[PDB]
Amino acid sequence: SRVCQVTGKRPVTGNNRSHALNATKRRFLPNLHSHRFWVESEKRFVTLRVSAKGMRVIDKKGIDTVLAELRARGEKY
Amino acid sequence: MQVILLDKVANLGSLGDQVNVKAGYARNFLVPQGKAVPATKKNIEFFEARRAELEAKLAEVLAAANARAEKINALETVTIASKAGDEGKLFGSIGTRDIADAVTAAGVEVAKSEVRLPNGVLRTTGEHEVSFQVHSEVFAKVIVNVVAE
Amino acid sequence: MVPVVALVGRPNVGKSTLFNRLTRTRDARKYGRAEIEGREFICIDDGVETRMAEQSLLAIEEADVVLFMVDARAGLMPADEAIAKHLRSREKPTFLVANKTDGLDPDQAVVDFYSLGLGEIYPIAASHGRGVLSLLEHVLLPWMEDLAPQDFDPQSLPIKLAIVGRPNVGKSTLTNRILGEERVVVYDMPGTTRDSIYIPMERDGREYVLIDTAGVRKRGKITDAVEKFSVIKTLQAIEDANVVMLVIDAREGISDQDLSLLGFILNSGRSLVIVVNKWDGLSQEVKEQVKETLDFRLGFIDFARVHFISALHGSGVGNLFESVREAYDSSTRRVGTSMLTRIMTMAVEDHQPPLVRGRRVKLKYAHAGGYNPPIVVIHGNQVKDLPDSYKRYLMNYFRKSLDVMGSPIRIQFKEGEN
Amino acid sequence: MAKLTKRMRVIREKVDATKQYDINEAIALLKELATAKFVESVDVAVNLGIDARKSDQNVRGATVLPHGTGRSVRVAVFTQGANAEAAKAAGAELVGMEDLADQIKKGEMNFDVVIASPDAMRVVGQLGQVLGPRGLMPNPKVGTVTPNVAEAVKNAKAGQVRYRNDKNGIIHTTIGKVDFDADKLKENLEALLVALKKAKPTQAKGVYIKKVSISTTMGAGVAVDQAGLSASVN
RNA sequence: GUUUAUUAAAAACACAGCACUGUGCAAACACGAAAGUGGACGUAUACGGUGUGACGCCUGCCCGGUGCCGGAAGGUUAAUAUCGAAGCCCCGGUAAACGGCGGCCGUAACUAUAACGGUCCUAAGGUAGCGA
RNA sequence: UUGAGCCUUGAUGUGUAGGAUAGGUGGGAGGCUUUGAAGUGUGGACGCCAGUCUGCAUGGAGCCGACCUUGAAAUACCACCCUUUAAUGUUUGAUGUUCUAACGUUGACCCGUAAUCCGGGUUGCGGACAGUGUCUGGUGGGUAGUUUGACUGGGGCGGUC
RNA sequence: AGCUUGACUGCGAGCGUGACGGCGCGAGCAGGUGCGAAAGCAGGUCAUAGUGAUCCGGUGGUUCUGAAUGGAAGGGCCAUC
Q1: Chains that touch C (3 or more CB pairs under 8 A)
Q2: How far is A38 from chain B (nearest CA, A)?
Q3: Distance, CA of D16 to CA of D83 (rounded, Å)
Q4: 3-state SS class at C211
Q5: In chain B, which residue's Cα lies nearest the Cα of A41?
Q6: Distance CA D157, CA C205 (A)
Q7: Which of A67, B67, C390, D173 could cysteine-pair with B148, CB 3.0–4.6 Å?
Q8: Domain spanning B69-148 has what CATH number?
Q9: Residue C326 vs residues A60, B78, C179, C370, C406: alpha-carbon distances, Å
Q10: Taking a C-beta distance cutoff of 8 angstroms, is the pair D217, D35 a contact?
Q11: Residues paired with residue C42 on neighbouring β-strands, in sequence order
Q12: Is B18 in a helix, a strand, or coil?
């Protein structure tokens, strides 16, 4: 997809906008990328699709804490 | 993020230097390689007590890694220790090509720019003879006896 | 050689307002003089623009007498004091006046002002009427002791020309070149119109204009709060022409506004000569033949003549001077009922005057209603009996059979016979 | 030209970096510090913003203040059609248009502070061409280009603080001498400090007071335990 | 040849041939938010696009070298009010330049048209097609 | 390799007057600046260099200006921040080059699986790029909504308000 | 031609003239002024044309407003763009 698997993402509703203030809508994709994280706790990579807010978030809490979850979020490790 | 190093010495940062670093260097080089451990005001306390042991007891056959490193960054005088660099000069058949294993920088190497030899090289003691190519399909050679202690 | 009042009083404000009220002469345009009795003299007009400091500095040294100005609500101001000091050292006499004087009868003058390294500050009028009288009298007296400098042929006027174009290109710079070849700045403003506007100036008698609103390298005394006022000027640029020059770029030219601008030019009814400036830096395969082709097809029958100059090199410089003259001759061509009638006959015989409601029309002479932008009025059948198109067809024919590298020519139709 | 900016680096490294000092302590310090040979000046260096308006910023003048004491000056009260006739009733000082007129136009002057209505003021305190003082001179502005005369004489008789440089948006005001007492000095600051808050109504930034600093000369200066701020007038 | 089924068959549309451009493969491009797919199991003598319309016959003018043309800013030539602008380099622009594609003069036999040079310009120079 | 954000040194300010070179001094003609203090490059109004030229390389005069004039100002002792300019501390961004470790790999092979898909692993090649996400400037009749009066001896035309 | 600054100020019986928006005339009182010897005259121009609502914002003044509560912003008001 296009979702962090942590932070919680998906494109979300938009519009182009003008000082004209016209009406149209467009959504908005977050900045996610599947980045090859190193589990270390089984010393392998479990490449996950993740946000780039999230990339930070994973770091601050540490590998097996995001990876503590997933299991607790009932979804592909 | 920030780490306390585990590394003995490292070209910047050394010997339990707790510092902040680039995120893109830190998570994919300083860790996971053993050259650092994450820092937290929890971690630092654990680590401070630990490093009187860890950055000593581990870090004492590792003097080799900093020295041997030059020799594999150039690949002109391809030299690693198989057991050595901490035992005196690099000796025995042991080292590079006698198992055809030597560490590369990034798989782009000048240590297999030709293959030709019938049982590899290395077979002296108290020094270790490497083959130092002079072409890429003739092996007229210029063998050296470098060490990297 | 000759005096100039030379207003100063800080870079801007009501400074201009006063010049208009002292002048009355337009189309002499700028430089330009304020008339009093018999004698007329010129007028001349932190962290401010470097260009604006250079012109202003250029103005005051040639200036021959100076007038330093203060406002009602203005008083104290050290910057003013610096400008006043500069003037003393360099040495020309200065009188201290104060704009739309107001207050509540003369009071705070002269009291602040004695420190100004100047004494007696005369208060003025401009929106009342007594306070102008003293200033004009003061100047008069020394100036009275002295007495300083104060079909019709194509050569009866000197050729009038403007330089119009985009609100992007540094046209004002190209303007500096055209006036130059001397390697000298020239956009020093004096004031002589009604209100705060704008330079047409003349060199070689013949008039050049600088126009539009910003990017032009309009960074002036200011007067067009919105996008509008500038346009009031370009319409002046129309009034004054018999030649207009369009600067277009090869890298921001022919913009939507710009193509409209050429369409407008056709209305403007004045000779088009097409300039491309800052064209020595363009890529070796030019973009730009096609850019010429799209304008060509719209299409402007004139003489072009394309110019590829820079204001930062100059290449086209002669070829521009030349092209305008040639264009003016054709435009201004001595005309004459005879020629027109004779070529016309051919045209109608060849391709057929239109018929309307089973009744065939009738043409029967043409004459020239003036030549400078050439107009003709042909007396034939009714206005609607021709479409505008056939008018134009017959016009285009004349545009063809006798050269018009000049402006579009005009055709009219009157009725009387039917 | 510039050999090394070393002598100034060590010195500024001692007592400036916004080292906030007791106002009085500062003054105690102020007389000497680096070898400046005699007792020096007490200054406040007040930083005000902007250009296009002043209220008491770049003033080639002196204004009346709470606690006027420090100096007392010569004063003549010029009483001509104004708040002069209120001044005639007041009878403090000397009030007289045509006798003080003479005295103005005589050839000689010494009544520095012209409290004034229209004619006198232009003469005394402003004149010269490339004006500027022997080190001090009769000054023009005294707020009688904001004429009042009667009440003005009371304020005037008492004295007055002169400050001047040129054109910068930061308003310097020399507070006094060190041959004036420490606590009287503090009061001079406080007075100017209350005034400044008062000053400037014309929005361009709603707090116009940056640094209240107190300083002398020879790379010696300090900051005040800032107390000019917006809250009312303190 | 193709075609407006249920008015209109053509001169329309098509078409080989030709011309031009764009594209080096993960191709251009095209579809498909993308994934993917087509393009192509191919591979610049092609591929895509665009455009013109068999065929034959009507001559399609390269800016680099060096020169030339206009122009200024300079260079170069000047006085030595130094600065040096006019003519020329250069900057742009220039091949109806050297050199392949006109006249006019002499000359391929009614002189005259002329392959060569002179002459207009540091134009090849009516050779092709076509002649009162 | 190399721009610049800031930091503190530099010293001074063309009309008679004014020695010239008068930005801006609380206070204003002691400070025993003790040392026997100086006239010699930056500076400086302005090159109008001069000389006066610099806390700016000499020792030669009590510790010392070796006190003012005079104009607007200018000489005891100095003070208040600017324009300007370095030297130095820096702070930061560019380019330059090389690297590998993200990342890409429509290279090659091994493997789940006697599967052109995919996944994992190995290796080869690329490489901090590329590309993409946000933000953001320019372009954009391709797409989108609509705008284009009225008077009127038919209307439009014109002319007019 | 002398002299002045009433192109004052705060109000206004009472009128004309407009559908309304509204526009015009108007003595006198009051207060302050100005000029005139004094009476007296001065409320912009011989009269008739010389321009536009409403918004919304700018300028200056005011305490009027002002959300716990004081200030403070913005808004109203008065004047003007």
Answers
A1: D
A2: 8
A3: 48
A4: coil
A5: B32
A6: 68
A7: B67
A8: 3.10.430.100
A9: 78, 82, 19, 19, 8
A10: no
A11: C4
A12: strand
